[PDB]
């Protein structure tokens, strides 16, 4: 009765958003304000802002009521 | 996230006809409520006059949230205006005056968003005497629960600004054909204000509103960005999805095209008739 | 002792009040008029009087183990007898030990006096300093 | 289970300084009908 | 009018919770009335409402209803018999590695959903992990929970129970990510393995001292760029106790989970998703089914 | 000094807890069955009455509130020295060998 991890498929009605790690080497983070060293001392990485902006940009595009 | 939100589930309607149905139903409900309790008095407002007064008081809501002494973030203003739109989608202007509901929507948007403002500050942002500020605060607190009930306790509003920024990031990244997409930023701010003036917030997703603003700015500036839709969004293959998105964008652009701002004489007459309706309850 | 009594009547007054309320509610018939709520009033007012009554006897301090006997329904009076036997028996322990180790002091010092002639006076000082002067 | 009173003294803050909120009007639930009572002996 | 009170569940400093039953579905719920100057509806209640209205997961509490009357409101959640705190503190019922794995799995699945929705449960502790008779753990209260994505927002460093606070929050980080929830989850797992609060601090300085003497002070190669936080103070270099000494009966995979959840660098700290992908949850002792989880009877 | 509960505090809690309990019951009584509402009152009254009986015995005993803790500490003090000497003596047996080793 073991456990297998499933990636929590939640269906966003929009174009695919690249993963948070595969996000600075696609070029996105060049166009996001760099996180300050103090901010980086916490959990903030300036790719959270990029990833949230991209997820809200593509959240519902392929969807009408 | 919008795709799971209550804004998608409940407050996103299929056509302007459904919006007009809801508003005419609210107006008719108030009219029948007034008639059945002690039958065609011209004191009442029509649904289109109610819409004119709603447009006027949404303009005044933008003006208030723009001169707010602490710099109100634009998400808070968008949330307050969305609350105004919904509240008067399902409620009649003659029951609840739009100035008090204007201030109440601003208040609840300041609280639901985490723009932390004390009540004395919030009423100090009102161009009334301190007695008038105290009374306005009393009315706001009276009407705050009513506003939250009339929103069906759906307090999270998704504004097109964050999808606008995310589209700009993706556009600077994967769309090298476009250089310096910030000219688009200025013109799309203009179009986004224009489109916030209309009822498109209840009809399209914030992502679609942001994309329409961006592509409208491109079209005004002579840029073609069909390669950003077909490619870089992979609408080259699901042609039906591409045409569906284009229809959404054309519909909402036309919706901004046909918007007629509230007048100056008509708004004066409507304000006077509304205050006569409120005085004689 | 006047305050001790004064608190006692109020405590037993409440106990009688509970019985009357319990009997009235148990033996409830239509022939009762305004006789039930008045009893409850005497109860609530009775409770308030106790709060004023506990403060004049504030100086009384109840030991922890005593209330333990009360909590379990034990015999606190027996504990007083137990303490009485406790003190009397253990008073012999402190004295019995003292007397046990005092005779060892007296006899041993006397023995030191019978072995060393040149240090005779010093041993007499040991007994003197061995007392509590 | 009867050692509560001992336990009641380690947490005085359970009862605030003077008394808990009281509303005599709300005590209308003590208006009792005339009914029997099983599984209970006097 | 539609819900009938059944039990007087209790109070929090801003709410009164009563067990109740609806006359429409005869389902047992928990109604939460909020108390009452010149500010209006309490912001903790509005935060509950706004955040729980847009979440629907098995392992997050859901407000089945919300209503109210003059100047006051009442929320209506699933009724949850216990929390994880009463399960931890009850010496009668044991927490086998499978039971611990079940609680951890439910917690991290709920938190993974909550983090994919860019919401941050900034107060995670065994008290706030309720669970029903079906043994389904739910994240309890969102009265201090926020959206952590956007940057223009200046958060507050004081918001999480001290015992379950990450080092960066104690150092005064006004900006943070999912590391605060994950540190509180690591502390919950530690309290779940020891049955006593891991790192119980008397103050922020004491909490930091205990974190550092239990895990070792970070050396700026483990938590690089640490010295920039607003309330950073240098600490004596503690060695820290090896994790296989603190938890002497935890498997190597569980030790790796502990190490990941207790990384000082709030960016190297594992997230709920990658925590769920670690060998601990996939290894031989499966999590217990919610039906077999122990319930504290009375 | 510490080993003892104040008489005033002991009376203070029971009065309020019985009052507090009653208030808790007042909410449940209206929403209970006709036959069940009486059970709570009778059980609460009997249970509350028994709690008050303990205080009655406590007060009647108050005459000895002064000279029980005095002997309890004194007896332990004599017992402490009586046993500390025994515990003391057991230590020397080790010292009579351990100390000789140390020297």
Curated annotation (Swiss-Prot), chain B:
Classification via Pfam families: Cyclin_C_2, Cyclin_N
Modified residues (Phosphoserine): 5, 129
Subunit text: Associates primarily with CDK7 and MAT1 to form the CAK complex. CAK can further associate with the core-TFIIH to form the TFIIH basal transcription factor.
Protein species of origin: Homo sapiens
Single Gene Ontology BP annotation: regulation of transcription by RNA polymerase II
Family: Belongs to the cyclin family. Cyclin C subfamily.
Gene name in the database record: CCNH
Protein name: Cyclin-H
Keyword Cell cycle carried by entry: yes
GO MF: cyclin-dependent protein serine/threonine kinase regulator activity; kinase activity
SUPFAM superfamilies: Cyclin-like
Function: Regulates CDK7, the catalytic subunit of the CDK-activating kinase (CAK) enzymatic complex. CAK activates the cyclin-associated kinases CDK1, CDK2, CDK4 and CDK6 by threonine phosphorylation. CAK complexed to the core-TFIIH basal transcription factor activates RNA polymerase II by serine phosphorylation of the repetitive C-terminal domain (CTD) of its large subunit (POLR2A), allowing its escape from the promoter and elongation of the transcripts. Involved in cell cycle control and in RNA transcription by RNA polymerase II. Its expression and activity are constant throughout the cell cycle.
Predominant location: nucleus
Swiss-Prot record, chain C:
A single GO molecular function term of this UniProt record: ubiquitin protein ligase activity
Keyword Signal: no
Domain of life where this protein originates: Eukaryota
Intracellular or extracellular location(s): Nucleus
Listed GO biological process terms: positive regulation of transcription elongation by RNA polymerase II; positive regulation of transcription initiation by RNA polymerase II; protein ubiquitination; RNA polymerase II preinitiation complex assembly; somatic stem cell population maintenance
Ranges in a coiled coil: none
One Pfam family per UniProt: Med10
Gene Ontology annotations for the cellular component aspect, listed alphabetically: core mediator complex; mediator complex; nucleoplasm; nucleus; ubiquitin ligase complex
Assembly information from the UniProt record: Component of the Mediator complex, which is composed of MED1, MED4, MED6, MED7, MED8, MED9, MED10, MED11, MED12, MED13, MED13L, MED14, MED15, MED16, MED17, MED18, MED19, MED20, MED21, MED22, MED23, MED24, MED25, MED26, MED27, MED29, MED30, MED31, CCNC, CDK8 and CDC2L6/CDK11. The MED12, MED13, CCNC and CDK8 subunits form a distinct module termed the CDK8 module. Mediator containing the CDK8 module is less active than Mediator lacking this module in supporting transcriptional activation.
Family: Belongs to the Mediator complex subunit 10 family.
PANTHER family noted in UniProt: MEDIATOR OF RNA POLYMERASE II TRANSCRIPTION SUBUNIT 10
Descriptive protein name: Mediator of RNA polymerase II transcription subunit 10
Swiss-Prot record, chain E:
GO molecular function terms attached to this record: ATP binding; ATP-dependent activity, acting on DNA; cyclin-dependent protein serine/threonine kinase activity; protein kinase activity; protein serine kinase activity; protein serine/threonine kinase activity; RNA polymerase II CTD heptapeptide repeat kinase activity; RNA polymerase II CTD heptapeptide repeat S5 kinase activity
Keyword entries, A-Z: Acetylation, ATP-binding, Cell cycle, Cell division, Cytoplasm, DNA damage, DNA repair, Kinase, Nucleotide-binding, Nucleus, Phosphoprotein, Serine/threonine-protein kinase, Transcription, Transcription regulation, Transferase
Positions annotated as active site in the UniProt record: 123 (proton acceptor)
The keyword Transferase is assigned to this record: yes
PROSITE patterns tied to this protein: PROTEIN_KINASE_ATP, PROTEIN_KINASE_DOM, PROTEIN_KINASE_ST
Cellular location(s): Nucleus; Cytoplasm; Cytoplasm, Perinuclear region
Tissues and organs where the protein is expressed, per its UniProt entry: Ubiquitous.
InterPro entries: CDK (IPR050108), CDK7 (IPR037770), Kinase-like_dom_sf (IPR011009), Prot_kinase_dom (IPR000719), Protein_kinase_ATP_BS (IPR017441), Ser/Thr_kinase_AS (IPR008271)
Post-translational changes noted in the entry: Phosphorylation of Ser-150 during mitosis inactivates the enzyme. Phosphorylation of Thr-156 is required for activity. Phosphorylated at Ser-150 and Thr-156 by CDK2.
Induction, per UniProt: Repressed by DNA-bound peptides.
Predominant cellular place of this UniProt entry's protein: nucleus
Leading EC class: transferase
Residue list for modification Phosphoserine: 150
Modification Phosphothreonine occurs at: 156
EC number(s) recorded for this UniProt protein: 2.7.11.22, 2.7.11.23
Record-linked SMART domains: S_TKc (SM00220)
Protein kinase domain boundaries: 3-281
Record has Transferase as a keyword: yes
Tree of life domain: Eukaryota
CDD domains according to UniProt: STKc_CDK7 (cd07841)
Mutation effect (residue 77 to G): Enhanced capacity to bind ATP analogs
Record protein name field: Cyclin-dependent kinase 7
Originating organism: Homo sapiens (Human)
Gene from which the chain derives: CDK7
Swiss-Prot record, chain F:
Motif residue range(s): LXXLL motif 1: 25-29
Localization: Nucleus
Tissue and organ distribution: Ubiquitous.
Origin: domain of life: Eukaryota
Quaternary structure and partners: Interacts with GATA1. Component of the Mediator complex, which is composed of MED1, MED4, MED6, MED7, MED8, MED9, MED10, MED11, MED12, MED13, MED13L, MED14, MED15, MED16, MED17, MED18, MED19, MED20, MED21, MED22, MED23, MED24, MED25, MED26, MED27, MED29, MED30, MED31, CCNC, CDK8 and CDC2L6/CDK11. The MED12, MED13, CCNC and CDK8 subunits form a distinct module termed the CDK8 module. Mediator containing the CDK8 module is less active than Mediator lacking this module in supporting transcriptional activation.
Record family assignment: Belongs to the Mediator complex subunit 14 family.
Function: Component of the Mediator complex, a coactivator involved in the regulated transcription of nearly all RNA polymerase II-dependent genes. Mediator functions as a bridge to convey information from gene-specific regulatory proteins to the basal RNA polymerase II transcription machinery. Mediator is recruited to promoters by direct interactions with regulatory proteins and serves as a scaffold for the assembly of a functional preinitiation complex with RNA polymerase II and the general transcription factors.
Protein known as: Mediator of RNA polymerase II transcription subunit 14
Organism per entry: Homo sapiens
Protein's gene: MED14
Range within the parent protein: 45 to 147 of 1454
């Amino acid at each position: 009765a073991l456990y297998e991890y499933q990636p929590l498929q939640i269906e966003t009605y929009g174009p695919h958003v690249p993963e948070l790690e595969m996000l600075g080497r696609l070029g996105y983070l060049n166009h996001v304000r760099a996180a300050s060293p103090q901010d980086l001392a916490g959990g903030y990485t300036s790719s959270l802002a990029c990833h949230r902006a991209l997820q809200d940009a593509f959240s519902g595009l392929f969807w009408q009521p | 996230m919008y795709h799971n939100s209550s804004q998608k589930r409940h407050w996103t309607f299929s056509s302007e006809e459904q919006l007009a149905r809801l508003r005419a139903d609210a107006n008719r409900k108030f009219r029948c409520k007034a008639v059945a309790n002690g039958p065609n008095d011209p004191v009442f407002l029509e649904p289109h006059e109610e819409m004119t007064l709603c447009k006027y008081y949404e303009k005044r809501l933008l003006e208030f949230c723009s001169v707010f002494k602490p710099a109100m973030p634009r998400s808070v203003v968008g949330t307050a205006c969305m609350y105004f739109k919904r509240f008067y989608l399902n409620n009649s202007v003659m029951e609840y005056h739009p100035r008090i509901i204007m201030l109440t929507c601003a208040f609840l948007a300041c609280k639901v968003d985490e723009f932390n403002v004390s009540s004395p500050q919030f009423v100090g942002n009102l161009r009334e005497s301190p007695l008038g500020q105290e009374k306005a605060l009393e009315q706001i607190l009276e009407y705050e629960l009513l506003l939250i009930q009339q929103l069906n306790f759906h307090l999270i509003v998704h504004n097109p600004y964050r999808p606008f920024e995310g589209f700009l990031i993706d556009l600077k990244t994967r769309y090298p054909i476009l250089e310096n997409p910030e000219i688009l930023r200025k013109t799309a701010d203009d179009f986004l204000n224009r489109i916030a003036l209309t009822d498109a917030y209840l009809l399209y997703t914030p992502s679609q509103i942001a994309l329409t603003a961006i592509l409208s700015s491109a079209s005004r500036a002579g840029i073609t960005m069909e390669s950003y839709l077909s490619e870089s969004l992979m609408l080259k293959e699901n042609r039906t999805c591409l045409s569906q998105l284009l229809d959404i964008m054309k519909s909402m652009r036309n919706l901004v095209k046909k918007y007629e701002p509230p007048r100056s004489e008509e708004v004066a007459v409507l304000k006077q008739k509304l205050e006569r309706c409120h005085s004689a309850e | 002792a006047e305050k001790f009594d004064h608190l006692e009547e109020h405590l037993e007054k409440f106990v009688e009040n509970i019985r009357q309320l319990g009997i009235i509610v148990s033996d409830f018939q239509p022939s009762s008029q305004a006789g039930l709520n008045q009893k409850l009033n005497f109860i609530v007012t009775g409770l308030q009087d106790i709060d004023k009554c506990r403060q004049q006897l504030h100086d009384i301090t109840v030991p922890l183990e005593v209330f333990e006997y009360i909590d379990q329904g034990r015999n606190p009076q027996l504990y007083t007898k137990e303490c009485l036997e406790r003190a009397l028996a253990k008073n012999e322990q402190v004295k019995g030990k003292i007397d046990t180790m005092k005779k060892f002091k007296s006899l041993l010092i006397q023995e030191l006096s019978k072995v060393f002639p040149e240090d005779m006076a010093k041993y007499r000082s040991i007994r003197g300093e061995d007392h509590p002067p | 289970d009867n050692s509560s009173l001992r336990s009641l003294i380690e947490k005085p803050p359970i009862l605030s300084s003077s008394f808990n909120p009281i509303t005599g009007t709300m005590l209308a639930g003590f208006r009792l009908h005339t009914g029997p009572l099983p599984e209970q002996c006097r | 009018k539609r819900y009938e009170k059944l039990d007087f569940l209790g109070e929090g400093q801003f709410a009164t919770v009563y067990k109740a039953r609806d006359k429409n579905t005869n389902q047992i719920v928990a109604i939460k009335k909020i108390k009452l100057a010149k500010d209006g509806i309490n912001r903790t209640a509005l935060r509950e409402i706004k955040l729980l209205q847009e979440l629907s997961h098995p392992n997050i509490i859901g407000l089945l209803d919300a209503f109210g009357h003059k100047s006051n409101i009442s929320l209506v959640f699933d009724f949850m018999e216990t929390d994880l705190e009463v399960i931890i503190k009850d010496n009668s019922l044991v927490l086998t590695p499978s039971h611990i794995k079940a609680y951890m799995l439910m917690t991290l699945q709920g938190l993974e959903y909550l983090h994919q929705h860019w919401i941050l449960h900034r107060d995670l502790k065994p008290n706030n992990l309720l669970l029903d008779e079906n043994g389904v753990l739910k994240l309890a209260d969102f009265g201090l929970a926020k959206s952590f994505g956007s940057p223009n927002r200046a958060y507050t460093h004081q918001v999480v129970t001290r015992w379950y606070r990450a080092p960066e929050l104690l150092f005064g980080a006004r900006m943070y990510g999912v590391g605060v929830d994950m540190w509180a989850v690591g502390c919950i797992l530690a309290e779940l393995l020891l049955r006593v609060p891991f790192l119980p601090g008397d103050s922020d300085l004491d909490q930091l001292t205990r974190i550092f003497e239990t895990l070792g002070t970070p050396t700026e190669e483990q938590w690089p760029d640490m010295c920039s936080l607003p309330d950073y103070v240098t600490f004596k270099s503690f060695p820290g106790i090896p994790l296989h000494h603190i938890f002497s009966a935890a498997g190597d995979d569980l030790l790796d989970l502990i190490q990941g959840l207790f990384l000082f660098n709030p960016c190297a700290r594992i997230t709920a998703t990658q925590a769920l992908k670690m060998k601990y949850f996939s290894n031989r002792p499966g999590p217990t089914p919610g039906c077999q989880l122990p319930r504290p009877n009375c | 000094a510490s080993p003892g509960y104040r008489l005033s505090t002991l009376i203070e809690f029971l009065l309020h807890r019985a009052y507090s309990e009653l208030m808790v019951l007042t909410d449940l009584l209206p929403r209970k069955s006709d036959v069940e509402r009486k059970i709570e009152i009778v059980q609460f009254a009997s249970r509350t009455r028994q709690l008050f009986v303990r205080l009655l015995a406590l007060v009647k005993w108050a005459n000895n509130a002064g000279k029980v803790e005095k002997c309890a500490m004194i007896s332990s003090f004599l017992d402490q020295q009586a046993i500390l000497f025994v515990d003391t003596a057991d230590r020397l047996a080790s010292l009579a060998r351990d100390a000789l080793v140390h020297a």
